[PDB]
């Protein structure tokens, strides 16, 4: 019963336009204890205990859950006016978009996500859906991890092979995300269809090194896709590797 804290009153929520189309995600206004209204995003879909757990997460690189409304469940998240990282990367290759993102900003995006994942990993919370599209830009342009908790080409081999999903599978997905950032938005594995992905990986193939990327960066990405999950580093290792790489630039 005490997990009533996470529940938000339906009349404090005003729903507006669709943002994207399991269920709908909408823009909205949440009335706060402050008297003020906050712009929110609202994803429709036990399940309050996990949401209460997620509500307690508090890190600059992890999206904060505001609460839930219900029997129709909706999760309240802060609206991020700058949107997802994937779209940002792609827009940056176009005029009227952001300017050309230099390597340093790209590496800083990877650090933000790795810090975000280090936090979640320390609390044994699996993300299970990490991709550039589920990484959000704050108003200060720091990145935060989103859409965790509740995509074939972000899924580790052992997880395609069996039902298994660990933090090392999240690590695999972080690797692919790093590649998404390095390539400024390419879909993983050009020329490989989704249904041939398990056989492709089983034969030892991985994402190829982007053209002008440092070997040092590719080394880091690659370590994320080692066949044995135990051979993959932790997020705390990755995080420090990317910090020292960025530092050396
Ligand atoms: N907190 C938020 N603030 C602003 N926009 C958001 C937020 N959360 C999601 N969106 C956007 O709403 C749209 C639909 O969301 P979503 O269902 O997460 O689609 P998606 O990008 O395919 N991610 P997923 O379905 O988790 O793989 C996307 O454009 C999101 O970037
Ligand atoms: Mg998403």
Residue numbers in the entry: 575 to 595, 598 to 621, 633 to 657, 665 to 744, 763 to 861
What sentences appear in the manuscript?
The ADP and ANP nucleotide structures superimposed very well with an RMSD of 0.11 Å. These structures show that the DFG-Asp motif is in the “in” position, with Phe742 buried in its canonical pocket, forming van der Waals contacts with residues in the αC helix, αC-β4 loop, β6-strand, and αE helix. The DFG-Asp741 is poised in a catalytically competent state; its carboxyl group is involved in hydrogen bonds with (1) a chelated magnesium ion and its coordinated water molecules, (2) the amino group of the catalytic lysine (Lys619), and (3) the amide group of the catalytic Asn728. The magnesium ion is coordinated to the α- and β-phosphoryl oxygens, two axial water molecules, the Asn728 side-chain, and the DFG-Asp741 carboxyl group, consistent with a typical protein kinase catalytically competent state. However, αC-Glu (Glu637), which is a critical residue for catalytic turnover, is in the αC-Glu-out conformation. Although mostly solvent-exposed, one oxygen atom of its carboxyl group hydrogen-bonds with the backbone amide of Leu744, the first and only residue of the activation loop that is ordered in our structures. The side-chain of Leu744 is buried in the interlobe pocket, above DFG-Phe742 and between the αC helix and the β4- and β5-strands; it is also protected from the solvent by the side-chain of the αC-Glu637. High-resolution, complex structures of the Mer kinase domain were determined, showing autoinhibited αC-Glu-out conformations.
Mer is a transmembrane tyrosine receptor kinase with extracellular immunoglobulin and fibronectin-like domains that recognize ligands such as growth arrest specific 6 (Gas6) and protein S. Ligand-binding leads to autophosphorylation of activation loop tyrosine (Tyr749, Tyr753 and Tyr754), recruitment of adaptor proteins (Grb2, LimD4, and Vav1), and activation of downstream enzymes (PI3K, MAPK, and GTPase). Mer behaves as a proto-oncogene, having roles in cellular transformation of NIH/3T3 and B-lymphocytes cells. To characterize the active site and regulatory mechanisms of Mer and advance rational approaches toward the development of chemical probes, crystal structures of its kinase domain with nucleotide ligands ADP and ANP and the inhibitor compound-52 (C52) were determined. These structures had good electron density for most residues and revealed the canonical protein kinase fold: β-stranded amino-terminal and α-helical carboxy-terminal lobes.
